[PDB]
Amino acid sequence: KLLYTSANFLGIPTNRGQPKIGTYQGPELIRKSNFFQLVAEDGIQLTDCGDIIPVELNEAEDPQRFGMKWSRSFSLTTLRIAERVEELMKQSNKSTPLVIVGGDHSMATGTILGHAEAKPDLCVLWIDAHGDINTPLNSASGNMHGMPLSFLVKELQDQIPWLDDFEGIKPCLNASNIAYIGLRDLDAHETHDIRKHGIAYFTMLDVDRMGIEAVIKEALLAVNPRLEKAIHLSFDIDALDPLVAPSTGTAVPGGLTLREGLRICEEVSATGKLSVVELAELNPLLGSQEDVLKTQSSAVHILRACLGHCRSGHLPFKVRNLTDQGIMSRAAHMQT
Amino acid sequence: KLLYTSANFLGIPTNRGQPKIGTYQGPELIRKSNFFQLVAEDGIQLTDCGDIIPVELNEAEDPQRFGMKWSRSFSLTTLRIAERVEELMKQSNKSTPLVIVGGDHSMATGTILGHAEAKPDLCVLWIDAHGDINTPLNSASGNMHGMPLSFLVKELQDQIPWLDDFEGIKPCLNASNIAYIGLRDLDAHETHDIRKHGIAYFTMLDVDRMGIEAVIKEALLAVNPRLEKAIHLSFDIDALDPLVAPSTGTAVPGGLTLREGLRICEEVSATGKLSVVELAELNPLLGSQEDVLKTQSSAVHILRACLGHCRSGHLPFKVRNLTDQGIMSRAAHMQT
Amino acid sequence: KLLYTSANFLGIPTNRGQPKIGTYQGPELIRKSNFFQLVAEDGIQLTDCGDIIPVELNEAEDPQRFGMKWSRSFSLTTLRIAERVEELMKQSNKSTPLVIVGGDHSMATGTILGHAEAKPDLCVLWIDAHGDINTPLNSASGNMHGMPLSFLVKELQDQIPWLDDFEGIKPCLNASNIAYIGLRDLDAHETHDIRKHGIAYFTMLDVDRMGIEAVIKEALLAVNPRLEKAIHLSFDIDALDPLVAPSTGTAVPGGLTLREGLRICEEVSATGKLSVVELAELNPLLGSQEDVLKTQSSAVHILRACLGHCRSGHLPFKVRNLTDQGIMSRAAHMQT
Ligand SMILES: N[C@@](CCCC[B-](O)(O)O)(C(=O)O)C1CCN(Cc2ccc(Cl)c(Cl)c2)CC1
Ligand SMILES: N[C@@](CCCC[B-](O)(O)O)(C(=O)O)C1CCN(Cc2ccc(Cl)c(Cl)c2)CC1
Ligand SMILES: N[C@@](CCCC[B-](O)(O)O)(C(=O)O)C1CCN(Cc2ccc(Cl)c(Cl)c2)CC1
Ligand SMILES: [Cl-]
Ligand SMILES: [Cl-]
Ligand SMILES: [Cl-]
Ligand SMILES: [Cs+]
Ligand SMILES: [Cs+]
Ligand SMILES: [Cs+]
Ligand SMILES: [Cs+]
Ligand SMILES: [Cs+]
Ligand SMILES: [Cs+]
Ligand SMILES: [Cs+]
Ligand SMILES: [Cs+]
Ligand SMILES: [Cs+]
Ligand SMILES: [Mn+2]
Ligand SMILES: [Mn+2]
Ligand SMILES: [Mn+2]
Ligand SMILES: [Mn+2]
Ligand SMILES: [Mn+2]
Ligand SMILES: [Mn+2]
């Protein structure tokens, strides 16, 4: 009765991809929730594989290079993440989805790198208000969480500056393997690159005009037309409207409703090809206590959908019956 | 110009169906609002018929039986409610809708029981995040507000334990007479029963895929295909998204928008068959002061829609004209 | 690459159209935001033309007349506004949109009056929870922000009382030139007038049944069928749901989502006929600090859409390239 009967859970508390402290508490926000319990109530066996420890260098060891902040912390963390994800995905080779909770979105360079080592023909569905595809000299901020796809996309490599410590970060994605949903705050140079190299993208304007059901269908058709490929689902929590996920660093008004979010994850889950889902940019240090609780529960419902939770209900494993307990029913009594 | 020119209002402050104190203040939350005034501004004559007094036994008088909490308080309250609703509906036999404000949802066993005495061929539209159809041995909580339909549905009576004090609670509904809208947190055994006995149900997944306009149409077609039957509309306020109804005991993210809620009620009202509407699970003791105000106003707009309020406007009874007052208009002056 | 390369910005801090203090701070709420900066980042040259000073008489100078509150302050302010807007629109005669930030909605009588002097064949798109078309003897409140269209519509002039100081407020609109979107709280006499004189109107019920995409299309077809006419877009911030614009004086539940709001403005902008947009009823003195921030940002995104901001992204003016900076790319290095 289950598409996935087992899953792995992994925390990655990245916080050097952007300057607001708190994304390192993202994984704990989910472990504190009722997520594990709810997943078990649906019959799925979920193993907590712990946390990856990011490499966090001090300032002297990691000065700006090409405007990037903490780029050596990033290159070392990226390789450490990729190694771990690769090994998790190879022991898994019904499939066993890996659920990753961040951490700021700079982690995706590592998770996709490692994922692609185990499954080189994968596709990527990127759910985000933002493109996360700035090349370093175009980044207005220097924040690495705004650049993680640019290092992975083969077509962009003539706009990435060479750095020795980045050598092991091999571009493993073709522009044709990525589709965006949720965009509403692209930088001009992101827009240029996306359109030039033909990356499939469905912005909130597309969601408004097409509806989320057509958008999901067209995104899957664009990068996984016959469901042949493993799916890496990279879900930025700020893809969702600030009304349901306020506790995140770069919140943008006019986002996906929670329900639109669930629909993306439900459809992706139902392909049977969900290989990795990562959830980025939870920051429980942002907003009120009630803000944190809203963001937490949105995250939990999103992750549950990813593992196959069905809003139209699940059947019980064992169907209970009164007579087995030696109890007299109303129907039985009315008979006698 | 009005489908219903008169209506009755009844409070039922049930609070022994679930453990959070405060649902007993639900009716007063609405009497304190501008509801009565707004209904009068549309030309509808609304009579406040007061409150039913629930039977609330002490612990010694009402211990657990088959895991149910406060089950004798429930059986006695159910009969008291049914008697009152029956008598209100028979004096009413244009029709006169009865508007009931709860109170936790355990009251529905009584309201439907009494309603069905006056109108035995009725149908039920159940608007809820939850199924409220757990049979007692499957209930994980023992809370009666999670069980009220199970006692009414004929097909379920071989899974209801016999209790003498429940004898007068006669199953008056066929599975074929009920349709759900809004579901998103069914228990596994609810799912089993609903599907086994073919109860029409439209979950939030159906609402996402079909749209609320098709959902309403299909729900009405399923249980009232030619508008021959009286309608009992049982509206749990937690059917609506927590963003618009936060002050309720079992809030579930991803609910109906207020507008989707209004559309259900507008269509149900416009059939001319709305016989009873009850609004359950208001708890003004939950949430901030602003939470309570949001929940209150959502409830008021919902109830107004039920009585035929039209968002596209109403015509005046008397059309006013300047000349009657002996006043010179701009047009008149420009003439002379 | 731009439909409008220049725009003017004008504040009108009206506050005598309604009794809650604070709408006079509306323009400053927007000047304090990042609006100007964001508009510049899209390549649009925006000139701040300052504020109009409303005429605010004391009580003795301005007693009630025909139940209207502050009607002489209104007539004098209306003429002062109209003169200023006219002169701004004539120097502008690619077109140069005028962006007006209120101020309560009583200002529209003046802005449309002056606009129509420069462009007499204009059409009006009125985005509002309310009709703002009460004639003075039908107004239950006496608040002028609830009456501004009634003075402009030729067909209504036999229901406007003559007042000498109103003589210069010439009715410049035909009922056939106006379309509403967003209505959900019409007064009965508004409903009567709208239907009698055939004013196009699309309420939230129409938005629910038709969807905003069809609604926009039909509104534009009704009053600007071949895009021949200049458009006056009069956007009441309370058209939007209180969840995204809480800081306004007459908030009504069940409004446009922010996204629906953006879609209206995006389509209106894209006609190339957007001549004036005014944004009314911001009140930063209402609600919490976070309420004010939500309302502010909703306003900013709305105004940006009006000037042609594209949620699917903009192309850069200058495309940057690594080699120009004498930097070695990853691709280049891999070659050698
Ligand atoms: N793209 C961003 C955000 C990336 C967020 C990372 B995510 O939360 O993981 O999706 C990034 O940091 O790369 C910024 C960049 C700056 N824009 C506004 C902007 C645009 C153009 C100019 Cl010239 C300037 Cl000065 C500012 C907002 C998004
Ligand atoms: N169905 C509920 C809620 C009924 C709310 C009553 B209403 O607010 O009037 O609609 C009820 O109380 O009957 C609960 C039951 C427990 N589930 C979660 C759950 C599911 C399965 C298991 Cl095994 C466990 Cl331990 C927990 C949530 C809804
Ligand atoms: N139309 C209103 C609001 C206008 C708001 C101006 B806006 O914020 O610029 O759109 C205005 O002030 O003109 C009121 C009038 C009173 N109704 C409720 C009502 C209806 C009928 C009667 Cl008989 C009574 Cl006593 C009350 C709400 C909107
Ligand atoms: Cl597209
Ligand atoms: Cl169905
Ligand atoms: Cl219409
Ligand atoms: Cs826990
Ligand atoms: Cs696109
Ligand atoms: Cs905080
Ligand atoms: Cs009252
Ligand atoms: Cs179903
Ligand atoms: Cs409280
Ligand atoms: Cs500023
Ligand atoms: Cs209409
Ligand atoms: Cs305040
Ligand atoms: Mn983002
Ligand atoms: Mn991101
Ligand atoms: Mn419920
Ligand atoms: Mn319920
Ligand atoms: Mn308004
Ligand atoms: Mn208005």
Answer yes or no: do A254 and C301 touch at CB < 8 A.
yes
CATH number for the domain harbouring residue A285: 3.40.800.10
3-class SS shares of chain B: helix, strand, coil, % to 5: 40, 15, 45
Which of the ligands is closest to the CA of residue C67?
3
Sign of CA dihedral B89, B95, B101, B103: positive
Closest approach of chain B CAs to the CA of C204, in angstroms?
A: 7
Q: Which residues of A86-97 are buried (b: 16+ CB within 10 A; e: fewer)?
A: bebbeebeebbb
Q: Cβ(A248)–Cβ(A292) under 8 Å?
A: no
Rg (CA), chain A: 21
Burial class from Cβ neighbours inside 10 Å (0-12, 13-18, 19+) for residue B226 reads: exposed
User: How many domains is chain C built from?
Assistant: 1
The token pair at A59 is 């300032």
Domain range holding A289? 1-336
Q: Cβ(A38)–Cβ(A314) under 8 Å?
A: no
Alpha-carbon dihedral angle through residues C24, C30, C31, C37, given to the nearest 10 degrees: -170
* Nearest atom of ligand 3 to the alpha carbon of C280: 9
Count of pairs with CB atoms under 8 A, one residue in B, one in C:
90
Answer yes or no: do C313 and A203 touch at CB < 8 A.
yes
Can you tell me which residue has the tokens 């309370």?
Answer: C238
Find, among B17, B153, B175, the residue nearest to B81 by Cα.
Answer: B17
Amino acid identity at B265: C
Distance CA A28, CA C278 (A): 47
The SS3 assignment for A305 reads helix
Tell whether residue B130 is among the known ligand binding residues. Answer: yes
Q: Cβ(C330)–Cβ(A166) under 8 Å?
A: yes
Beta-carbon neighbours within 5 Å of ion ligand 21: C 105, 128, 132, 236
Q: A178 pairs with which residues across the strands?
A: A124
Answer yes or no: do A204 and C244 touch at CB < 8 A.
no
HSE, CB side, 13 Å, CA atoms: give it for residue B47: 10
Find, among A165, A167, A197, A163, the residue nearest to A180 by Cα.
Answer: A197
Distance CA C230, CA C234 (A): 13
The region, left, alpha or beta by phi > 0 then psi within -120 to 50, assigned to residue A149 is alpha
Measure CB to CB from residue C301 to each of A205, A243, A253 and give the nearest one. A253
Tell whether residue B132 is among the known ligand binding residues. Answer: yes
Number of H helices, E strands in chain A: 10, 8
**What is the DSSP code (8-state) at residue B169?**
-
DSSP calls for C85-151: HHHHHHH------EEEEESSGGGHHHHHHHHHHH-TT-EEEEE-SS-----TTT-SS--GGG-TTTT
Ligand 2, atom 10: closest residue by C-alpha: B130
DSSP calls for B223-236: H-TTS-S-EEEEEE
Ligand 1, atom 4: closest residue by C-alpha: A146
The SS3 assignment for A276 reads strand
CB within 8 Å of B304: residues ≥ 6 apart: B35, B38, B39, B42
The SS3 assignment for C188 reads helix
Resolution of the experimentally solved model in angstroms: 2.2
E-assigned strand segments in A79-119: 98-102
CA separation (Å) from C38 to C1, C263, C303, C333?
17, 19, 11, 37
Q: Cβ(B308)–Cβ(B314) under 8 Å?
A: no
Q: A72 pairs with which residues across the strands?
A: none
Can you tell me which residue has the tokens 């073919």?
Answer: B198
Tell whether residue C238 is among the known ligand binding residues. Answer: yes
The SS3 assignment for A230 reads coil
| Alpha carbon of A256 to ligand 14 centroid (Å) | 29
| Alpha carbon of C196 to ligand 20 centroid (Å) | 22
Distance CA C8, CA C13 (A): 16
Phi, psi of C170 (to 5 degrees): -80, 130
Tell whether residue B208 is among the known ligand binding residues. Answer: no
Testing the interface with C: which of A156, A202, A243, A252 to mutate, by most C Cβ within 10 A?
A: A243
B184 close contact with A: CB closer than 8 A: yes
Ligand 1, atom 2: closest residue by C-alpha: A146
Sign of CA dihedral A107, A111, A114, A116: negative
CB within 8 Å of A309: residues ≥ 6 apart: A38, A39, A42
Find, among C298, C293, C232, the residue nearest to C261 by Cα.
Answer: C298
Q: Cβ(B271)–Cβ(B231) under 8 Å?
A: yes
Sign of CA dihedral A194, A195, A197, A200: positive
Sign of CA dihedral A78, A80, A86, A88: negative
Angle at C78 (CA atoms; ends C73, C82), nearest 5 degrees: 155
Distance CA C310, CA C312 (A): 5
CA separation (Å) from C327 to A73, C248, C317?
22, 53, 21
E-assigned strand segments in C176-329: 178-183, 200-203, 231-236, 274-280
Q: Cβ(C146)–Cβ(C137) under 8 Å?
A: no
Answer yes or no: do B311 and C194 touch at CB < 8 A.
no
Q: Cβ(A260)–Cβ(A212) under 8 Å?
A: yes
Q: Cβ(B308)–Cβ(B2) under 8 Å?
A: yes
Sign of CA dihedral C80, C85, C88, C93: negative
Residues of C in contact with B211 (CB under 8 A): none
Q: How many CB atoms lie within 10 A of CB B60?
A: 6
DSSP calls for B110-129: HHHHHHHHH-TT-EEEEE-S
**What is the DSSP code (8-state) at residue B171?**
-
Burial class from Cβ neighbours inside 10 Å (0-12, 13-18, 19+) for residue A335 reads: exposed
**What is the DSSP code (8-state) at residue C67?**
T
Find, among A276, A187, A206, the residue nearest to A234 by Cα.
Answer: A276
E-assigned strand segments in chain C: 6-12, 45-51, 98-102, 123-127, 178-183, 200-203, 231-236, 274-280
Distance CA B201, CA B183 (A): 8
Best residue among A23, A250, A278 to mutate for probing ligand 1's pocket (most ligand atoms within 8 Å of CB) is A250
Distance CA C270, CA C231 (A): 11
CB within 8 Å of C244: residues ≥ 6 apart: A243, A253, C257, C258, C294, C295, C298
Distance CA B260, CA B212 (A): 6
Distance CA A301, CA B253 (A): 8
C297 close contact with A: CB closer than 8 A: yes
The SS3 assignment for A312 reads coil
Burial class from Cβ neighbours inside 10 Å (0-12, 13-18, 19+) for residue C306 reads: buried
Interfacial C residues in 70-129 facing B (CB < 8 Å): none
CA B69 and chain centroid, separation: 23
Find, among C191, C178, C42, the residue nearest to C116 by Cα.
Answer: C178
Best residue among A141, A149, A201 to mutate for probing ligand 1's pocket (most ligand atoms within 8 Å of CB) is A141
Q: Cβ(C136)–Cβ(C148) under 8 Å?
A: no
| Alpha carbon of A233 to ligand 17 centroid (Å) | 12
Phi, psi of A255 (to 5 degrees): -95, -175
Interhelix angle for A258-270 vs A212-223, to 10°?
40
Can you tell me which residue has the tokens 């309604």?
Answer: C18
